[PDB]
């Protein structure tokens, strides 16, 4: 449990830093609408919280990894 | 023919965009109360941008609206600073106009060092009588094509009333 939970914690942090590059650069944000922009940052707000909490397990952290990825990938693709 | 097609001032609304929340904004709202005599209303930032250092749901501006003779008087003070000279591009296709002033104490408020210095924005709305048709709740409709103001008409009204000039 100690190792399994700790592995998922790093991967969730990696993607949050990863998506910040897309939203920061002007080239990709130029053609992407606000309505998609504010929905990503809204999802990022509660992501920050559960790292601080200690009760989160592998299942909860892994679920929001794909939930955040699924949300952002729909905007860029179309 | 011109029985009921005479222009008038519908309302004048003027705002200050301080751009950042805190005690500074509260002082700006304090300034605006005595200018109009009415309590002002705050505004919230709907975007969230790091370049300007603002987020969502934070107050960044204030504004207030006035109507009737009070709007007529306050508009006169603003044009005095502008010495009744406006640029032709200040009039929109609808028939409205506005301007801004850098210094709020250029007209007298008996300057106080505590409140500070702010820059204010001016805007007013023209109209014709019987425009309630588009705003009543019951049987709302749309006004006709011949009964709406054009750009040329409002500048003619401005020059004839205030004896001002357009550049």
């Amino acid at each position: 449990a100690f190792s399994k939970r700790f592995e998922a914690k790093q991967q969730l942090e990696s993607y949050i830093s990863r998506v910040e590059e897309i939203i920061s650069d002007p080239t990709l944000s130029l053609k992407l609408k606000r309505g998609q922009k504010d929905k990503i940052e809204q999802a990022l707000s509660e992501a920050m919280a559960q790292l601080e909490i200690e009760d989160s397990t592998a299942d909860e952290l892994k679920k929001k990894e794909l939930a955040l990825k699924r949300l952002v990938t729909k905007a860029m693709a179309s | 023919q011109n029985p009921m097609r005479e222009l008038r001032i519908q309302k004048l609304v003027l705002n200050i965009s301080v751009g950042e929340s805190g005690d500074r904004l509260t002082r700006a709202a304090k300034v605006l109360e005595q200018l109009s005599g009415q309590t002002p209303v705050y505004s919230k930032a709907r975007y969230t941008v790091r370049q300007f250092g603002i987020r969502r749901n934070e107050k960044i501006a204030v504004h207030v609206t006035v109507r009737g003779p009070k709007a007529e008087e306050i508009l006169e003070r603003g044009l005095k600073v502008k010495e009744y000279e406006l640029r032709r591009r200040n009039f929109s296709e609808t028939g409205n106009f506005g301007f801004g002033i850098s210094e709020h104490i250029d007209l007298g408020i008996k300057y106080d060092p505590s409140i500070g210095i702010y820059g204010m924005d001016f805007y007013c709305c023209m109209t014709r009588p019987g425009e309630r048709v588009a705003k009543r709740r019951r049987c709302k409709s749309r006004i006709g094509a011949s009964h709406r103001i054009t750009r040329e008409e409002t500048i003619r009204w401005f020059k004839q009333r205030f004896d001002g000039i357009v550049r």
């Binding site: - | 709740r137 019951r138 049987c139 709302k140 409709s141």
Partner: protein, 300 residues
């Protein structure tokens, strides 16, 4: 430069709303709940009391819904209130009480329940509802109807509840509560019961005249021009409306005649045909194009 949003494809995909919603006269969301009835009771009708306010009139009707349209049971306006001794303030709140009372008495006599269900018969600012009247060694339930307010905002003291109050005192049963009547204080959740009585007989407009006369003579003269000409004073307002109530119950079918020009039903049809316009025929419409072509070609 951007897309022209209103192109030929935009019109084709456009779906228009109901005709009476385009004009903004009805609210179908609220209408559905008013007219539908439980399928257990098959053909028992539902009676509505509609109230509409114009600039210079008040309209009241009794309506039942049908599959091919509405049916009107009894109607009462504010024009007919002139025959009972009222000529001014036809749209104040008190005038609503009078026309509300006229319709309630007018409908009961239509279906033969006028002798019973007399009502209060002496207006008072009390919250009461019509109850069953004992007769022939039995109990008969009163006539029931509901209120249709249309698009008017239902705030405290609005005139829409005045017609509701007036018809309730007539004898008809209309379920309601007292928290919207004037004189109701939301803080103490209590009804004064005396402001309502004063405010029924035109007391509120009576206090306006005396207050306005002292403070502003010229304004008081302009607003009440027609009151002064027929020398009706503030003291006489209460006795004026109280006498009007007596004549409503005595004879609700008294006929009123206006001063507008009058003709027979058929002569009006002939008069209107004079000003009608005739559509252009196909041959005439085609001929104009050649004339338009010839002069436009010759213009340049």
């Amino acid at each position: 430069f951007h897309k022209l949003v209103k192109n030929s494809a935009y019109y084709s995909r456009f779906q228009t709303k109901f005709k009476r919603r385009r004009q903004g006269k009805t609210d179908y969301y609220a209408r559905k709940r008013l007219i539908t009835q439980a399928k257990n009771k098959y053909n028992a009708p539902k009676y509505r009391l509609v109230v509409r306010f114009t600039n210079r009139d008040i309209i009241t009707q009794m309506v039942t819904s049908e599959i091919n349209g509405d049916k009107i049971f009894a109607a009462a306006y504010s024009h007919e209130l002139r025959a009972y001794g009222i000529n001014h303030g036809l749209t104040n709140w008190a005038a609503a009480y009078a026309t509300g009372l006229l319709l309630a008495r007018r409908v009961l006599a239509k279906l033969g329940l006028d002798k019973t269900f007399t009502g209060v018969e002496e207006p008072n600012g009390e919250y009461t509802l019509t109850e069953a009247a004992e007769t022939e060694d039995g109990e008969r339930r009163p006539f029931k109807a509901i209120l249709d307010v249309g698009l008017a905002r239902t705030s405290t003291g609005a005139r829409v509840f005045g017609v509701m109050k007036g018809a309730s005192d007539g004898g008809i049963f209309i379920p309601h509560s007292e928290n919207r009547f004037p004189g109701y204080d939301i803080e103490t959740e209590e009804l004064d019961t005396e402001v309502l009585k004063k405010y029924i007989y035109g007391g509120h407009v009576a206090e306006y005249m005396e207050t306005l006369a002292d403070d502003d003579e010229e304004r008081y003269k302009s607003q009440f021009v027609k009151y002064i000409e027929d020398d009706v004073e503030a003291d006489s307002l209460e006795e004026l409306y109280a006498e009007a109530h007596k004549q409503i119950r005595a004879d609700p079918f008294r006929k009123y005649v206006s001063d507008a020009p009058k003709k027979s039903k058929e002569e009006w049809k002939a008069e209107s045909l004079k000003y009608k316009k005739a559509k252009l025929s196909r041959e005439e419409r085609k001929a104009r194009v050649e004339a338009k072509i010839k002069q436009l070609l010759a213009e340049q």
